[PDB]
From Swiss-Prot:
GO MF, one annotated term: protein kinase activity
Protein name, UniProt field: [Pyruvate dehydrogenase (acetyl-transferring)] kinase isozyme 2, mitochondrial
Alphabetical list of Pfam families matching this protein: BCDHK_Adom3, HATPase_c
Gene3D superfamilies xref list: Alpha-ketoacid/pyruvate dehydrogenase kinase, N-terminal domain, Histidine kinase-like ATPase, C-terminal domain
Gene name of the record: PDK2
One Gene Ontology cellular component annotation held by this UniProt entry: mitochondrial matrix
Top-tier EC class: transferase
SMART domains: HATPase_c
Domain called Histidine kinase: residue spans: 121-334
UniProt-listed GO biological process terms: cellular response to nutrient; cellular response to reactive oxygen species; glucose homeostasis; glucose metabolic process; insulin receptor signaling pathway; intrinsic apoptotic signaling pathway by p53 class mediator; regulation of acetyl-CoA biosynthetic process from pyruvate; regulation of calcium-mediated signaling
Its job: Kinase that plays a key role in the regulation of glucose and fatty acid metabolism and homeostasis via phosphorylation of the pyruvate dehydrogenase subunits PDHA1 and PDHA2. This inhibits pyruvate dehydrogenase activity, and thereby regulates metabolite flux through the tricarboxylic acid cycle, down-regulates aerobic respiration and inhibits the formation of acetyl-coenzyme A from pyruvate. Inhibition of pyruvate dehydrogenase decreases glucose utilization and increases fat metabolism. Mediates cellular responses to insulin.
Highest taxon, organism lineage: Eukaryota
Amino acid sequence: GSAPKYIEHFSKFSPSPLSMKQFLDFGSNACEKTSFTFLRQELPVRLANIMKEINLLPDRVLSTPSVQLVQSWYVQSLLDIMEFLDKDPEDHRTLSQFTDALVTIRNRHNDVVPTMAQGVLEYKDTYGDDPVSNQNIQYFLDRFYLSRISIRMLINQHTLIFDPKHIGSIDPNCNVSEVVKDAYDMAKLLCDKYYMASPDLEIQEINAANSKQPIHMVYVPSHLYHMLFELFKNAMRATVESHESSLILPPIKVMVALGEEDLSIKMSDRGGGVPLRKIERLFSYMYSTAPPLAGFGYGLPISRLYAKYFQGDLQLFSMEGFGTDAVIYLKALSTDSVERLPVY
Ligand SMILES: CN(Cc1ccc2nccnc2c1)C(=O)c1ccc(N(Cc2ccccc2)C(=O)c2ccc(O)cc2O)cc1
Ligand SMILES: CC(C)c1ccc(COc2ccc(CC(=O)NCCN)cc2Cl)cc1
Ligand SMILES: [Cl-]
Ligand SMILES: [Cl-]
Ligand SMILES: [Cl-]
């Protein structure tokens, strides 16, 4: 077949990062034809760029069942999208069977994450868990997952618009605190269920420019929830477990600061912290892979990719003996929120 040729062709192109503006302008609808003509080019670009990177992996990794699996998915998905390169954007069936095609692709790729996890696992027992294996896994998975996040963003934007207020997965009016409370309510629910004690939540807002206004932004709230949800899980585990032979359960304090470009979200706990040495391993896919509420692999690094994805970040610093702070940094301004795609 043609796969390695297509890979070859489209991996000469560079994925085109979009900004929230451009994202918003894509269904504000009837320029679905325009989403179609765009996506039939750009998915193959993006699919191919990562596919080529998968190929640069040494044979001992690439030859493993897990990788060969997801690689087979990427090939089929690229083929699936190929069928439409000739097709004409004015035939309303051309269009609606592209949607199906995108939907089907998105389901095909669902289990990528625990699949790669299995490859890491096999690799760990099969070749060792040395620092250098670890930089390498990290390097590849941070890019891959990031790649994949951006592919999904594209598919979801398309399928959700072409079945106001919300534009696909973008809320142009996301109330950050609203999303915080939700993630907290849900983490508490699970925290209550497994621990039978859950810390309270305290939120403070700091709108620097407008003392009064509630903090709203343009974002992808499911993205934000995911990140918050994961940080809640962790801060809850730590809070509860560090205090089981003690009466008070200190609340989890979250602050939302809106600056001139940063919108920053800090989740501070009193869980007794982590010493500085063990902080880098928390983001390591490898060290957080192994054969409840947490101990539950990948949430941190993936949450951090989520933040990186529109030029944000996610950092942890801890005080051993006291607790951990966790900061999600996001762009305040739609203008500054541009996709961040792995290089190639
Ligand atoms: C428990 N998980 C999930 C996880 C997932 C895969 C793993 N894989 C291997 C080992 N541990 C894993 C843990 C955590 O990441 C996690 C790690 C460290 C903390 N701890 C330390 C701690 C304190 C008391 C009791 C237990 C732990 C933290 O300080 C901490 C870390 C991140 C965070 O957002 C908040 C925190 O409070 C809290 C949570
Ligand atoms: C399953 C997926 C996540 C996975 C699992 C495991 C890995 C591991 O990847 C490694 C490990 C060691 C080396 C050293 C090497 O060969 N150096 C060459 C010397 N110049 C290179 C790579 Cl790409 C990647 C991806
Ligand atoms: Cl990255
Ligand atoms: Cl789109
Ligand atoms: Cl850090």
